[PDB]
Amino acid sequence: VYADSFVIRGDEVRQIAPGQTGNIADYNYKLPDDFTGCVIAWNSNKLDSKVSGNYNYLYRLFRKSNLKPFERDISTEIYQAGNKPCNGVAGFNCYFPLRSYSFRPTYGVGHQPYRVVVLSFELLHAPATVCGPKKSTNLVKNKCVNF
Amino acid sequence: RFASVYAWNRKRISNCVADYSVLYNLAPFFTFKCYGVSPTKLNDLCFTNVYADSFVIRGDEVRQIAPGQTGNIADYNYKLPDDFTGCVIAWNSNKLDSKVSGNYNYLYRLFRKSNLKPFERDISTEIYQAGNKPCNGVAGFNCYFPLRSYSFRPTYGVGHQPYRVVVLSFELLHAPATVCGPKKSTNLVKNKCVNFNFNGLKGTGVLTESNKKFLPFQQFGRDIADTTDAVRDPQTLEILDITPC
Amino acid sequence: DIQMTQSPSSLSASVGDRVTITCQASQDINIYLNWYQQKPGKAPKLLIYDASNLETGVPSRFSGSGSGTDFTFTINSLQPEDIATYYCQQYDNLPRTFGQGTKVEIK
Amino acid sequence: QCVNLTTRTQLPPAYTNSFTRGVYYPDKVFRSSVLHSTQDLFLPFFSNVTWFHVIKRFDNPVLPFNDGVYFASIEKSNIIRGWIFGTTLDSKTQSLLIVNNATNVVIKVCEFQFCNDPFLDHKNNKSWMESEFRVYSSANNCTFEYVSQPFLMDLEGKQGNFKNLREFVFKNIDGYFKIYSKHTPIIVREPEDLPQGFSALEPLVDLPIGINITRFQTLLASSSGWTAGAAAYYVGYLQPRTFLLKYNENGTITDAVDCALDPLSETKCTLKSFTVEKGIYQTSNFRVQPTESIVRFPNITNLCPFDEVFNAT
Amino acid sequence: VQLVESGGGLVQPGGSLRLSCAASGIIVSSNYMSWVRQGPGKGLEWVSVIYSGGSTYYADSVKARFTISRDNSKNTLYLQMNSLRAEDTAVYYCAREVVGSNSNMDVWGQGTTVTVSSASTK
Ligand SMILES: *[C@@H]1O[C@H](CO)[C@@H](O)[C@H](O)[C@H]1NC(C)=O
Ligand SMILES: *[C@@H]1O[C@H](CO)[C@@H](O)[C@H](O)[C@H]1NC(C)=O
Ligand SMILES: *[C@@H]1O[C@H](CO)[C@@H](O)[C@H](O)[C@H]1NC(C)=O
Ligand SMILES: *[C@@H]1O[C@H](CO)[C@@H](O)[C@H](O)[C@H]1NC(C)=O
Ligand SMILES: *[C@@H]1O[C@H](CO)[C@@H](O)[C@H](O)[C@H]1NC(C)=O
Ligand SMILES: *[C@@H]1O[C@H](CO)[C@@H](O)[C@H](O)[C@H]1NC(C)=O
C-alpha cells in the first residue's frame, strides 16, 4: 500500500480521476491510465484556508512537456514562451513556471481547498503485509473445504 | 479611455478565433481568478457568442466582483448571475489611467436603492429625492445626485488604483457555434511513417505526392473499402496520397 | 479587519493651545476616514466628511489633513463646549472599525 | 417606404412535372466510378411543380417553406433579384434577405418590417430601376452581415429569347443554411415544363444562421407601370428519400436513380446497379399502417392524499 | 428628519427583545441604516448595517445571531437577537450611515441603555 497526499481547489478535483486533461492532471500530478485503488476528498475550508490567505500551496502552470505517470518535478526555472532567449528575466515572453493560490473563506464552494488522499495498491502478485482484520482459524488437509 | 462604472460598455464579439496568450503578455505575471472554466482550457472549449464587457473600478472591488457577493459596484452597478459561465480578467493601470493632476472622468452609481437583476444596464441620470419631501429640483437638501466620481491620484497604494477589467462570458443555446481558435500548424513529412491529422482526420500512414485530380470544393478521398486514402493539404492546396506501411 | 490605533490617548494638558491628535491604520487607506465627537451620554456628531470636508455648523478653525495610513487634526482653540471624547473611524472597508477612544479635558 | 400597389390580376398557377431536375452533391467527398446509395432530402422524380409566369400580369405571392425548396428561373433579361426568408415578417422576429447588387451579393440577417408588395421594377412604365431600396422600415437588430461575389447576369432587359436557366436549392438543417446553385446557357426550346436531361448541382454557400424558417417570397424587378419582357419561374418541394448516385471518373455526378418511385426503380436501388436481369427479386415486405389509436383506463376522479403525507404536522 | 428611540427594560441571558428605531419621514427601506454599540468605560463598536438593496453586513462577533429589517411604511428599523451571552450590556445607537461620498447630511439618533444580567430588578 502507498499513500499520496495533497490539497487542490474544488473545481480541479475532477481532474484527479484517471485519464483527464488540464493543468493539474498533466503538469502537476498524473495518475496512470491503469489505476487500481481509491481516491478520497473532504472539504477542509476551516483547516487549510487561512482567513487572510495562505500561500503555502503552489501549482505549476507553464511547462514545456507533460508529466509521465507518478512523476514529480520540483524544478523552478523561467519558461521560454517564444523564440527569444531568456537568460533569466521577468520581462517579455519569459514567465515564472509556477504560481500560488490565495485561499480565503469568502470564496465560493468551488474555490475552497479540498483535501486529496490517493490510496494505491496492487493485488494477487506477492506476499501481503497489511490486510483485513479477519481472524484466522485451523487448517485441514484432504477434506473438501472452503479455503 | 474605458467606459465608466455607470455604463459598462457592451461588445458582442463573434465570428472569429480564440487567442488569449497575449492576455498573459499584457501585464507582469498575475492570477486570473477564473471561475467558469479552468484557465488552461480557454484556448480550447470553444463556444458561440463570446460576451465581453469593459469598465474600470477600484482594487478592492476586483475581489468583490465575484457572483454571490453584494456591495455598491457589484450590487448597484453590475451584478453577475449565480450560474455565470465565464470569468473576469484584471490588471493594474496606474501608468495609463491614473493622472497626476487628478482624473475624475470615471464615475459610479452609489444611490440606486433597487436590487439589480443579472446582466442589465441602468442609466438613472436624474436626481433622487428622499425624506417624503417632493424635491423635483436641482441642488437641494435631501436631493442627492446618484453619480459620483472616483479619485485616481497616483500617490495612492494598491487597493485604490484603477484596474481595467474585461469580464468575458459565454452562452450556449443550440446554434452552430462560430467562435473557435485553432493552432499548432506543423511541418509536413514525406516518405516517412506519420500520425497525421488533417482537418479533423485521425489515422496513420505514409504521405506521398499524388496524381488524382480533385474538384474545387471536394476535399477528402475514399476508396472502395470506404476508407480515407487521399487528403488535400489545408494550407497549400495540393493532393497527397496515403499508403499503408 | 484593520487594527485602528492612536497613541495620544489623553490631551488633557492643552487649554486653548496646540493639539496634535492623530490616528493610524494597519493597512494603507485613503481619505475615506472620519471622526465623531460624543458628549458623555448622548449620540455622537460629525465634524469632518471624507477627511477633507467640514461640518455645516462648527468653528472655522477646525482643519484636518491626512493620507497614507496617517490622519492628523488640530484644535488650537479649546472652547468650553468641546469638553468630550473624540473617536476615529475608517469606513468603506468592511468590517467598519472604530478607535479605542481619545480624552480631552480643560483644567 | 412603399405603397399599396394592388391591381393584382391573379390567375391560377400552372402545374408541370419535373423529369429529373434537382440533384446536388450530398457531401464533400471525392469518389471515382462508384455507385453510392444515399439518404437525404431530394426532389422526387416526376413530381408536380408550380409554374409562375410574369408578363400586365404579375406573380409574386408568399409561399410556404418546409424541408428546403427548389427554385428555378428561365430568363434572358435577369429580372429576378432576391429572396426573403422568415416566419413572421412583421419587425418582431428576425428575418433573412438575399439580394444581388450590380457588383455585390449581400446577405442580411436582421429585423425587418417588410412592405406589402416588395418590388423595385415599376419605373417609367417599361423602363427598369431598382429604386425604393427601403423595402424595410428600419434595421432594428442585425446579427449577420456578409458580402461576396454576385452571380452572372446580362446588362439591360431583353424580351423573350430566354437563354439562361438558373437552378437554386435552399436547405435549412441543424441551424445551417445551405444554398446550391447551377447555371445553364442557351435554351432554344420554348420555355415550358422545363428542359429535359440531367445536370448536377455543385455546392455554393453554407452559412450559420440558426434561425426559424417557415415561408419565403421571391423578389422580382411613379410606383406603378411595368411593360417589359416575359419571365417564368418554377418552385418545388422536397421530401426525405433515398437515391442511388453514379460518380464518374472525375467525381462528377452523371446519373441518379430513385428508390421509392417504381418497383423497377426499387429493385435497381436494391441491387446497387443500373441494370437488372430476368428473374425474381425480393425488395421489401408490406404491412398495414395503424388506422387510429384507442386507450382504456379506469374512471377515477378523487385526488390522492399526497398532501397529508407531505404536509403532516 | 429626527430619530425616535424605542427600547428599554431588563432581560435575562438567553432572551432577546424587539429593538426598534423610528424615523421622522426618512425612508428606512430605500436607504442605508446602521446601528452601533457604546459601552460604559469602553469605546464604540459597530454592530450592523443594511443597504437599500437588502444586503446585511454585521460584525463577525455576532455571526448568525442578529436579524435586521426595515419596515415598509412605519419608517422604523427592527432587529432581533439570538442566544445572548451577556456581554451586550450596552447602549445601541441607531442611525443611517453618515455620508456616502460627500454630503452635509449628518443626523444621529438617541439610544436606550439596555442591560442583560441574570439578576432581575431589585
Ligand atoms: C395598405 O393598407 C393597409 C390598410 O389600410 C395598411 O395597413 C398597410 O400599411 C398599407 N400598405 C402600405 C404599403 O402602405
Ligand atoms: C399534377 O398536375 C397535373 C397537371 O395540372 C394534374 O392533372 C394532376 O392532378 C396533378 N397531381 C397532383 C398530385 O397534384
Ligand atoms: C459593393 O459593396 C461595396 C462595399 O460595401 C460598396 O463600396 C460598393 O458600392 C458596392 N457596389 C455595389 C454595386 O453594390
Ligand atoms: C422615371 O420617371 C421619373 C418621374 O416620372 C423621373 O424622375 C425619372 O428621371 C425617370 N427615369 C428615367 C431613367 O428617365
Ligand atoms: C424556432 O426554432 C426554435 C428551436 O427549438 C424553437 O424553439 C422555436 O419555437 C422556433 N420558433 C418558431 C416561430 O418556429
Ligand atoms: C403544504 O402547504 C403549503 C401551504 O399551504 C402549500 O404551499 C404546499 O403546496 C403544501 N404541500 C403540498 C405537497 O401540496
PDB file of all heavy atoms in Angstrom, chain A residues 101-119:
ATOM      1  N   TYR A 101      -1.849  29.721  -4.997  1.00  0.00           N
ATOM      2  CA  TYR A 101      -3.210  30.145  -4.710  1.00  0.00           C
ATOM      3  C   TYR A 101      -3.221  31.175  -3.584  1.00  0.00           C
ATOM      4  O   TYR A 101      -2.218  31.417  -2.907  1.00  0.00           O
ATOM      5  CB  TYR A 101      -4.094  28.976  -4.280  1.00  0.00           C
ATOM      6  CG  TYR A 101      -4.027  27.699  -5.083  1.00  0.00           C
ATOM      7  CD1 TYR A 101      -3.239  26.637  -4.666  1.00  0.00           C
ATOM      8  CD2 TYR A 101      -4.811  27.527  -6.212  1.00  0.00           C
ATOM      9  CE1 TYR A 101      -3.200  25.458  -5.377  1.00  0.00           C
ATOM     10  CE2 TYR A 101      -4.778  26.350  -6.929  1.00  0.00           C
ATOM     11  CZ  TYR A 101      -3.971  25.319  -6.507  1.00  0.00           C
ATOM     12  OH  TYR A 101      -3.933  24.145  -7.220  1.00  0.00           O
ATOM     13  N   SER A 102      -4.394  31.787  -3.385  1.00  0.00           N
ATOM     14  CA  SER A 102      -4.682  32.580  -2.198  1.00  0.00           C
ATOM     15  C   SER A 102      -6.046  32.131  -1.664  1.00  0.00           C
ATOM     16  O   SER A 102      -7.083  32.722  -1.947  1.00  0.00           O
ATOM     17  CB  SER A 102      -4.663  34.079  -2.504  1.00  0.00           C
ATOM     18  OG  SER A 102      -5.906  34.506  -3.030  1.00  0.00           O
ATOM     19  N   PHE A 103      -6.042  31.070  -0.862  1.00  0.00           N
ATOM     20  CA  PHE A 103      -7.285  30.527  -0.331  1.00  0.00           C
ATOM     21  C   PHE A 103      -7.846  31.427   0.761  1.00  0.00           C
ATOM     22  O   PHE A 103      -7.146  31.791   1.710  1.00  0.00           O
ATOM     23  CB  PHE A 103      -7.049  29.118   0.212  1.00  0.00           C
ATOM     24  CG  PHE A 103      -6.777  28.098  -0.850  1.00  0.00           C
ATOM     25  CD1 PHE A 103      -6.147  26.907  -0.539  1.00  0.00           C
ATOM     26  CD2 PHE A 103      -7.108  28.348  -2.168  1.00  0.00           C
ATOM     27  CE1 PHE A 103      -5.881  25.973  -1.517  1.00  0.00           C
ATOM     28  CE2 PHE A 103      -6.856  27.411  -3.145  1.00  0.00           C
ATOM     29  CZ  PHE A 103      -6.236  26.225  -2.821  1.00  0.00           C
ATOM     30  N   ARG A 104      -9.116  31.778   0.627  1.00  0.00           N
ATOM     31  CA  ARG A 104      -9.804  32.642   1.569  1.00  0.00           C
ATOM     32  C   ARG A 104     -11.181  32.076   1.873  1.00  0.00           C
ATOM     33  O   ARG A 104     -11.805  31.443   1.015  1.00  0.00           O
ATOM     34  CB  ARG A 104      -9.931  34.069   1.013  1.00  0.00           C
ATOM     35  CG  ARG A 104      -8.669  34.898   1.185  1.00  0.00           C
ATOM     36  CD  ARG A 104      -8.946  36.382   1.048  1.00  0.00           C
ATOM     37  NE  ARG A 104      -7.761  37.180   1.336  1.00  0.00           N
ATOM     38  CZ  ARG A 104      -7.751  38.504   1.419  1.00  0.00           C
ATOM     39  NH1 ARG A 104      -8.851  39.215   1.241  1.00  0.00           N
ATOM     40  NH2 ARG A 104      -6.607  39.128   1.687  1.00  0.00           N
ATOM     41  N   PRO A 105     -11.679  32.277   3.098  1.00  0.00           N
ATOM     42  CA  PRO A 105     -13.001  31.726   3.445  1.00  0.00           C
ATOM     43  C   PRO A 105     -14.134  32.291   2.607  1.00  0.00           C
ATOM     44  O   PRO A 105     -15.126  31.594   2.361  1.00  0.00           O
ATOM     45  CB  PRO A 105     -13.152  32.099   4.927  1.00  0.00           C
ATOM     46  CG  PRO A 105     -11.757  32.338   5.409  1.00  0.00           C
ATOM     47  CD  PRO A 105     -11.041  32.941   4.244  1.00  0.00           C
ATOM     48  N   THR A 106     -14.012  33.542   2.159  1.00  0.00           N
ATOM     49  CA  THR A 106     -15.116  34.211   1.480  1.00  0.00           C
ATOM     50  C   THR A 106     -15.374  33.667   0.079  1.00  0.00           C
ATOM     51  O   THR A 106     -16.387  34.023  -0.529  1.00  0.00           O
ATOM     52  CB  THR A 106     -14.849  35.714   1.405  1.00  0.00           C
ATOM     53  OG1 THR A 106     -15.998  36.379   0.866  1.00  0.00           O
ATOM     54  CG2 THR A 106     -13.644  35.995   0.520  1.00  0.00           C
ATOM     55  N   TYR A 107     -14.491  32.821  -0.446  1.00  0.00           N
ATOM     56  CA  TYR A 107     -14.655  32.333  -1.807  1.00  0.00           C
ATOM     57  C   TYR A 107     -15.795  31.323  -1.890  1.00  0.00           C
ATOM     58  O   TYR A 107     -16.291  30.815  -0.880  1.00  0.00           O
ATOM     59  CB  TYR A 107     -13.359  31.700  -2.313  1.00  0.00           C
ATOM     60  CG  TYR A 107     -12.233  32.689  -2.505  1.00  0.00           C
ATOM     61  CD1 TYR A 107     -10.929  32.256  -2.690  1.00  0.00           C
ATOM     62  CD2 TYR A 107     -12.473  34.056  -2.507  1.00  0.00           C
ATOM     63  CE1 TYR A 107      -9.899  33.155  -2.868  1.00  0.00           C
ATOM     64  CE2 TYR A 107     -11.447  34.963  -2.682  1.00  0.00           C
ATOM     65  CZ  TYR A 107     -10.161  34.507  -2.862  1.00  0.00           C
ATOM     66  OH  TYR A 107      -9.134  35.404  -3.037  1.00  0.00           O
ATOM     67  N   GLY A 108     -16.209  31.037  -3.119  1.00  0.00           N
ATOM     68  CA  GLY A 108     -17.289  30.101  -3.345  1.00  0.00           C
ATOM     69  C   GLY A 108     -16.899  28.679  -2.998  1.00  0.00           C
ATOM     70  O   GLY A 108     -15.749  28.368  -2.685  1.00  0.00           O
ATOM     71  N   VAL A 109     -17.895  27.793  -3.056  1.00  0.00           N
ATOM     72  CA  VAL A 109     -17.673  26.396  -2.688  1.00  0.00           C
ATOM     73  C   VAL A 109     -16.667  25.745  -3.629  1.00  0.00           C
ATOM     74  O   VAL A 109     -15.897  24.864  -3.226  1.00  0.00           O
ATOM     75  CB  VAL A 109     -19.012  25.632  -2.659  1.00  0.00           C
ATOM     76  CG1 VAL A 109     -19.644  25.588  -4.043  1.00  0.00           C
ATOM     77  CG2 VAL A 109     -18.811  24.226  -2.113  1.00  0.00           C
ATOM     78  N   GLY A 110     -16.647  26.171  -4.892  1.00  0.00           N
ATOM     79  CA  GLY A 110     -15.718  25.589  -5.841  1.00  0.00           C
ATOM     80  C   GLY A 110     -14.284  26.032  -5.629  1.00  0.00           C
ATOM     81  O   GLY A 110     -13.352  25.362  -6.081  1.00  0.00           O
ATOM     82  N   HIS A 111     -14.083  27.159  -4.950  1.00  0.00           N
ATOM     83  CA  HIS A 111     -12.756  27.713  -4.732  1.00  0.00           C
ATOM     84  C   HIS A 111     -12.233  27.481  -3.320  1.00  0.00           C
ATOM     85  O   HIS A 111     -11.217  28.074  -2.944  1.00  0.00           O
ATOM     86  CB  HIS A 111     -12.750  29.207  -5.051  1.00  0.00           C
ATOM     87  CG  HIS A 111     -12.664  29.507  -6.514  1.00  0.00           C
ATOM     88  ND1 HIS A 111     -11.931  30.560  -7.016  1.00  0.00           N
ATOM     89  CD2 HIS A 111     -13.213  28.886  -7.584  1.00  0.00           C
ATOM     90  CE1 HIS A 111     -12.036  30.578  -8.332  1.00  0.00           C
ATOM     91  NE2 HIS A 111     -12.807  29.572  -8.703  1.00  0.00           N
ATOM     92  N   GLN A 112     -12.895  26.653  -2.533  1.00  0.00           N
ATOM     93  CA  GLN A 112     -12.356  26.293  -1.234  1.00  0.00           C
ATOM     94  C   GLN A 112     -11.482  25.054  -1.351  1.00  0.00           C
ATOM     95  O   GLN A 112     -11.719  24.188  -2.198  1.00  0.00           O
ATOM     96  CB  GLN A 112     -13.489  26.047  -0.232  1.00  0.00           C
ATOM     97  CG  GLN A 112     -14.405  27.237  -0.042  1.00  0.00           C
ATOM     98  CD  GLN A 112     -15.773  26.841   0.468  1.00  0.00           C
ATOM     99  OE1 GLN A 112     -15.935  25.788   1.083  1.00  0.00           O
ATOM    100  NE2 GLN A 112     -16.764  27.687   0.222  1.00  0.00           N
ATOM    101  N   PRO A 113     -10.457  24.932  -0.510  1.00  0.00           N
ATOM    102  CA  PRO A 113      -9.490  23.837  -0.662  1.00  0.00           C
ATOM    103  C   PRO A 113     -10.047  22.515  -0.163  1.00  0.00           C
ATOM    104  O   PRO A 113     -10.318  22.345   1.030  1.00  0.00           O
ATOM    105  CB  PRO A 113      -8.301  24.309   0.184  1.00  0.00           C
ATOM    106  CG  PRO A 113      -8.893  25.200   1.208  1.00  0.00           C
ATOM    107  CD  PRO A 113     -10.116  25.829   0.608  1.00  0.00           C
ATOM    108  N   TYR A 114     -10.219  21.571  -1.078  1.00  0.00           N
ATOM    109  CA  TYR A 114     -10.489  20.199  -0.693  1.00  0.00           C
ATOM    110  C   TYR A 114      -9.175  19.515  -0.334  1.00  0.00           C
ATOM    111  O   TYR A 114      -8.089  20.075  -0.496  1.00  0.00           O
ATOM    112  CB  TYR A 114     -11.220  19.453  -1.806  1.00  0.00           C
ATOM    113  CG  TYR A 114     -12.653  19.887  -2.009  1.00  0.00           C
ATOM    114  CD1 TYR A 114     -13.395  19.418  -3.083  1.00  0.00           C
ATOM    115  CD2 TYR A 114     -13.271  20.750  -1.115  1.00  0.00           C
ATOM    116  CE1 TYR A 114     -14.706  19.805  -3.269  1.00  0.00           C
ATOM    117  CE2 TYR A 114     -14.580  21.145  -1.293  1.00  0.00           C
ATOM    118  CZ  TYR A 114     -15.293  20.669  -2.371  1.00  0.00           C
ATOM    119  OH  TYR A 114     -16.598  21.060  -2.550  1.00  0.00           O
ATOM    120  N   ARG A 115      -9.268  18.289   0.167  1.00  0.00           N
ATOM    121  CA  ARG A 115      -8.090  17.507   0.502  1.00  0.00           C
ATOM    122  C   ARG A 115      -8.168  16.174  -0.220  1.00  0.00           C
ATOM    123  O   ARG A 115      -9.235  15.568  -0.330  1.00  0.00           O
ATOM    124  CB  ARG A 115      -7.964  17.290   2.012  1.00  0.00           C
ATOM    125  CG  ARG A 115      -7.263  18.418   2.737  1.00  0.00           C
ATOM    126  CD  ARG A 115      -7.090  18.093   4.203  1.00  0.00           C
ATOM    127  NE  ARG A 115      -6.167  19.008   4.860  1.00  0.00           N
ATOM    128  CZ  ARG A 115      -5.842  18.943   6.143  1.00  0.00           C
ATOM    129  NH1 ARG A 115      -6.351  18.018   6.938  1.00  0.00           N
ATOM    130  NH2 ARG A 115      -4.982  19.827   6.639  1.00  0.00           N
ATOM    131  N   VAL A 116      -7.024  15.719  -0.717  1.00  0.00           N
ATOM    132  CA  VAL A 116      -6.970  14.503  -1.513  1.00  0.00           C
ATOM    133  C   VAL A 116      -5.934  13.557  -0.927  1.00  0.00           C
ATOM    134  O   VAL A 116      -4.781  13.931  -0.688  1.00  0.00           O
ATOM    135  CB  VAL A 116      -6.657  14.798  -2.994  1.00  0.00           C
ATOM    136  CG1 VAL A 116      -6.521  13.504  -3.771  1.00  0.00           C
ATOM    137  CG2 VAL A 116      -7.744  15.666  -3.595  1.00  0.00           C
ATOM    138  N   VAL A 117      -6.372  12.322  -0.684  1.00  0.00           N
ATOM    139  CA  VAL A 117      -5.503  11.218  -0.296  1.00  0.00           C
ATOM    140  C   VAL A 117      -5.799  10.044  -1.217  1.00  0.00           C
ATOM    141  O   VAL A 117      -6.919   9.525  -1.240  1.00  0.00           O
ATOM    142  CB  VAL A 117      -5.701  10.824   1.177  1.00  0.00           C
ATOM    143  CG1 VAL A 117      -4.938   9.551   1.481  1.00  0.00           C
ATOM    144  CG2 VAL A 117      -5.255  11.948   2.091  1.00  0.00           C
ATOM    145  N   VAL A 118      -4.798   9.617  -1.981  1.00  0.00           N
ATOM    146  CA  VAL A 118      -4.982   8.593  -3.007  1.00  0.00           C
ATOM    147  C   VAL A 118      -4.282   7.332  -2.509  1.00  0.00           C
ATOM    148  O   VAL A 118      -3.057   7.252  -2.456  1.00  0.00           O
ATOM    149  CB  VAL A 118      -4.454   9.047  -4.362  1.00  0.00           C
ATOM    150  CG1 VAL A 118      -4.561   7.924  -5.369  1.00  0.00           C
ATOM    151  CG2 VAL A 118      -5.215  10.265  -4.834  1.00  0.00           C
ATOM    152  N   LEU A 119      -5.078   6.332  -2.136  1.00  0.00           N
ATOM    153  CA  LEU A 119      -4.523   5.027  -1.809  1.00  0.00           C
ATOM    154  C   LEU A 119      -4.262   4.240  -3.085  1.00  0.00           C
ATOM    155  O   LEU A 119      -5.143   4.112  -3.940  1.00  0.00           O
ATOM    156  CB  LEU A 119      -5.475   4.257  -0.898  1.00  0.00           C
ATOM    157  CG  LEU A 119      -5.666   4.804   0.514  1.00  0.00           C
ATOM    158  CD1 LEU A 119      -6.700   3.983   1.255  1.00  0.00           C
ATOM    159  CD2 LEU A 119      -4.352   4.810   1.264  1.00  0.00           C
TER     160      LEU A 119
END
